[PDB]
Amino acid sequence: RELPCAWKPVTYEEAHAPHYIAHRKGWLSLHTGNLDGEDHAAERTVEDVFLRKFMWGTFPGCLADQLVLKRRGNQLEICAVVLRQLSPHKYYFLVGYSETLLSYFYKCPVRLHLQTVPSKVVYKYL
């Protein structure tokens, strides 16, 4: 263009800035590690990193939004939001596959909670 001539849909998580994390947004992962006195916060962080990368590479172009990783006791719930573009048979295949891999990789009863949506739920435009 020209020098003084210079002088995108976003979901809720994308729209709101980091300084709203406890004001408007929430926390994607929920666990006891960061509480006072509790241990293994770093191990939970590393587990979260691996889960997010694995899920984004195992459901490519399906996840409409970011994961929600809940932990109760030794349970590990992945609440994901996906699109209605892939066939349900492939979704069932991938759910079973991912559940079994993550259970045998983290030695805990992992479980997965797909929620399909017709399309990205755009909050605003930035």
Partner 1 sequence: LHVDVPKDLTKPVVTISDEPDILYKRLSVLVKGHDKAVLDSYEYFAVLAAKELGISIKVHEPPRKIERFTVQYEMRTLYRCLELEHLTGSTADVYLEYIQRNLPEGVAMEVTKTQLEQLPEHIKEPIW
Partner 2 sequence: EVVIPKKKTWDKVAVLQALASTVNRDTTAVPYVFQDDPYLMPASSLESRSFLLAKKSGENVAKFIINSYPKYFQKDIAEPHIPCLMPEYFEPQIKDISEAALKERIELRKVKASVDMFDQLLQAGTTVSLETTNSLLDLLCYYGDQEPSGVTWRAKNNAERIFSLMPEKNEHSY
Partner 3 sequence: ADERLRINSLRVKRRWRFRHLADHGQLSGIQRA
Contact residues for partner 2, defined by CB under 8 A? 43, 74, 84, 88-101, 103-108, 114-116
Comparison of 18 and 118: residue with beta carbon closer to partner 3: 18
Q: Which does 13 bind (CB under 5 to 8 A by kind): partner 3, partner 1, partner 2, none?
A: partner 3
**Angle at CA 27, nearest 5°, toward 26 and 31?**
140
Instruction: Name residue, tokens 């006072």.
Output: 36
Comparison of 80 and 94: residue with beta carbon closer to partner 1: 80
- Which positions ≥6 away from 111 have C-beta within 8 Å? 75, 76, 77, 78, 99
**Separation of alpha carbons 34 and 41, rounded Å:** 6
- Interface ranges with partner 1 (CB under 8 A): 22, 27, 30-32, 34-38, 70-73, 77
